[PDB]
C-alpha cells in the first residue's frame, strides 16, 4: 500500500503538452497484470 | 457553509475593498486606437485639383 516515487515529465505536441508518468518497473509489472485481469473480467461480466 | 472550488477561489480582496469607495479603479488591457492611427495627426494637404497660386 506504499509505493515508490513516480517521475513526472512533459510531452510536447507543439500545441499542447501532457504529463508523462514514470513508474517503477516492478510496480509496472504488477499494474500491467492487474490492468489486463480487470479488463478481461469486466468484459466477461458486461461492466461497460 | 458554502463550497468554494479551487478554480473560483479568491486569494485577494477586490480593488474597491482596498482602494475605497471614492477611488476610480480602471483595468485597461486593450488599446482604443490601432497602431496606424497617429498620436499627433500630420498637417494634411489633400489637393484634389491643379490650381495656379498667383494669377498668370
Amino acid at each position: 500500500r506504499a509505493f515508490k516515487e513516480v517521475g513526472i515529465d512533459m510531452n510536447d505536441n507543439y500545441s499542447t503538452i501532457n504529463p508523462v508518468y514514470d513508474v517503477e518497473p516492478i510496480e509496472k509489472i504488477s499494474d500491467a497484470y492487474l490492468d489486463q485481469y480487470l479488463w478481461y473480467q469486466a468484459d466477461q461480466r458486461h461492466l461497460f | 457553509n458554502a463550497v468554494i472550488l479551487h478554480e473560483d477561489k479568491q486569494y485577494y480582496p477586490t480593488a474597491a475593498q482596498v482602494f475605497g469607495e471614492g477611488v476610480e479603479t480602471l483595468v485597461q488591457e486593450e488599446d482604443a486606437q490601432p497602431l496606424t492611427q497617429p498620436i499627433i495627426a500630420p498637417v494634411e494637404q489633400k489637393k484634389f485639383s491643379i490650381q495656379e497660386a498667383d494669377l498668370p
Binding site: 500500500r1 506504499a2 515508490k4 516515487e5 | -
Partner: protein
C-alpha cells in the same frame, strides 16, 4: 547487483555524500556508492536516513491520530503520513 539490502557502510557513505553535496544532487551520491541508483539513495534518505524521522516507539496520541486518519483516508498513506508525523511505511506498519 543494482539494489539489495542497505548496509551501515552504505548508509554512512550516503550521509557523508549528502553532507558534501546536498539533497538536490543524487547522481554524485550514487556515484560514491556502487550498488545503488540515485533513486534508491534518494528513497533511503527520504524513508530511513533522514534524522527528521521519529525512530522510537510510538506515543499513544500518535496511535489515535493514525487510527482516525486511517478512518478518514482509507489507503492514502502518503497523505496520512505528513499529518501523523512519520513516514508512509512507518504509519502502515
Amino acid at each position: 547487483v543494482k539494489g539489495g539490502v542497505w548496509t551501515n557502510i552504505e548508509d554512512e557513505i550516503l550521509k557523508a555524500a549528502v553532507s558534501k553535496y546536498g539533497l538536490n544532487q543524487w547522481a554524485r551520491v550514487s556515484s560514491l556508492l556502487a550498488r545503488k541508483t540515485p533513486k534508491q539513495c534518494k528513497a533511503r534518505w527520504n524513508e530511513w536516513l533522514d534524522p527528521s524521522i521519529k525512530k522510537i516507539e510510538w506515543s499513544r496520541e500518535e496511535d489515535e491520530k493514525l487510527l482516525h486518519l486511517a478512518k478518514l483516508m482509507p489507503t492514502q498513506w502518503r497523505t496520512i503520513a505528513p499529518i501523523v508525523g512519520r513516514t508512509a511505511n512507518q504509519c502502515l506498519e
